[PDB]
Amino acid sequence: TPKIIYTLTDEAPALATYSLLPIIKAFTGSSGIAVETRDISLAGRLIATFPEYLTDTQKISDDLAELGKLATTPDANIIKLPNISASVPQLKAAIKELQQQGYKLPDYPEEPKTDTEKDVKARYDKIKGSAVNPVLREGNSDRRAPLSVKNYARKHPHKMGAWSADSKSHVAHMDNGDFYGSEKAALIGAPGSVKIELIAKDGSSTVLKAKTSVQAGEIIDSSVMSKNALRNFIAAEIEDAKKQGVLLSVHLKATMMKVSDPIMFGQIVSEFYKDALTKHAEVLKQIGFDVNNGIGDLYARIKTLPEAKQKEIEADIQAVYAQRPQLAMVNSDKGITNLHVPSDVIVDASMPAMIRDSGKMWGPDGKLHDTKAVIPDRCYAGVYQVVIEDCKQHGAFDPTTMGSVPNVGLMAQKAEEYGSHDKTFQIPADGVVRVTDESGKLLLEQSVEAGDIWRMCQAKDAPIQDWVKLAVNRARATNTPAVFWLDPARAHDAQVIAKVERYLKDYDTSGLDIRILSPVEATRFSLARIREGKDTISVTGNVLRDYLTDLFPIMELGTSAKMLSIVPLMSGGGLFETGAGGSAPKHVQQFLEEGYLRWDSLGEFLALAASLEHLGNAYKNPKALVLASTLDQATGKILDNNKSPARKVGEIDNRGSHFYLALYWAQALAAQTEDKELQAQFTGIAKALTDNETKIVGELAAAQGKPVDIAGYYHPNTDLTSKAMRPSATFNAALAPL
């Protein structure tokens, strides 16, 4: 029974699992290994939150909560696939009814006016945003493209947009009054708790959070995005973006940042469609429009207004799209813009792609154009500017020659930003915010203004240490230079720098090129070594940890999904993430139309080949070490014979690869002698998958082209899905009888 948790999630990954999971299930079966599932998807996660509204047969164990515990225990061994960080819009909203609709009976959202609505909104809120990962991630990240993959990438280059030195593209960020510029850190001394309180000009005081425990050596910082400063910023960047003749695009993270970014998002959606939303201030107010949900929310709330009233609004909305620069578009043909849904454009992915595509993003028409990427803050806006100003001055990197920038990132215990939500408040009135402790000593204090966004972030000592170690560790094992991206300007990074400088003096530094630089300098020192073809380990915080693992990997491997991501749980556990990517919404869009799934499952093949080992090593299991030693191999054969997903209908799909994995794996096993047993109870298969390869492949491709219907999206009809994902009836019957 030794457990290995394969998590069930949301979109592409989700579908992929109906195909790869059974396979995985047949190989680990005869080696006394238990591969169980846990439903952490968006839908399941909700269906599990309101047991009271559901009936006996529609309930479903609360797995997030279970995994949450499993993560702190030593025998943890979890294979974690990407999952949706729901955004109030169609995300939280649409799946809620994807349920009720024809299914169950949960309940509704937004502006609560009744004790029932408040109790409910309060519970759903905990469900939207980044709820899974912060929990599971009880250790520090270590992402890195495995040689083979880098080597595959080098000989099978993914297209790269040509770069022009006279490009218009660039990144736009505020210059004053923002989180970056507002920072203020403090080093917690004694184990206690702090109170976050507002002191209004009117002498009164409002509590925002009374008790927030702080450990010794913990680092806490507070900053604030100024509403009117942001307002004055976005207003200028639009205006100017019109002169430049460029597309306006917003790169925020209104997904993980469940609290502040949707707010910044709306102020944008506000200062843009202002004339139209000002002309209809009340009509929207009635139907209850929520700008923080994108202009998209407007379009969906008005369908209830008189047929002619609608036309008026829409007709006026168009008048704005004529008075203002064209917005980059999420989907050019359906009109869906960058300002339609909070989570269509998420900075960590939006940018890498936008850089790749010659620094352009699809416009209203349907072609690519230079863009003005708006990254409001300054903490990580820089890093993208450098990379952007590098391309137009040296050309696109060559997948065939460029190096690699791994990333030993700090995240353990909801490190930094990743856990500031419950400490981010929208200021209720002009005043001053003060963070005090148990005695009453004033730790932090930052002036504020109504509408402003104030937050407090905390980085814990234990995590910073486990961090610094792993950093060195990698530095050694590869023997590559390794930089800490820590900006002295930031009162936070500053105190974290003290930590690092003092902890390296606890390990062996001899013969290692370890050094600390600003994300700005660091991106330069990196992009330098990179183009000439040299590697450079990236040791960074939690936010950069993502940005980069998504950035660099994309440039060199085409996909972040295409790499290794291991999370060494700080309690002998093992969090084995699939890829540095997320679900692939568009990947489902194609499947439900053409019957093609271009989702690459190499992330998982690595993840499996990763946990199968952790298993065998931490236990008395040789068999584990063998089916993982082989899996490692069959993977190789995947990259060597190009049995990875094509792009358009016709060649290979997903179970096509899943098939080769299955094929090459069976053979790899039935051709070894480390364990005669496996070799024997895998030959029956090995010589069946080769014989029916030509046919199976055919049976599979024999399902491409036509449309697919799975009765849903967030909570599909499992039956219909299995049959769509497991077409080849011959591959199936050649699996059950192992």
Ligand SMILES: NC(=O)c1ccc[n+]([C@@H]2O[C@H](COP(=O)([O-])OP(=O)(O)OC[C@H]3O[C@@H](n4cnc5c(N)ncnc54)[C@H](OP(=O)(O)O)[C@@H]3O)[C@@H](O)[C@H]2O)c1
């Ligand atoms: N759990 C996590 O760690 C995690 C991380 C990030 C995002 N997410 C969530 O995932 C969703 C997607 O966010 P997003 O808009 O930034 O899109 P995304 O899917 O993360 O963007 C990466 C893009 O690269 C390609 N790609 C990603 N994985 C691939 C794979 N396995 N094989 C082949 N190509 C792959 C796809 O584009 P092509 O059309 O070019 O193939 C995809 O649109 C969001 O709801 C987000 O909240 C979860």
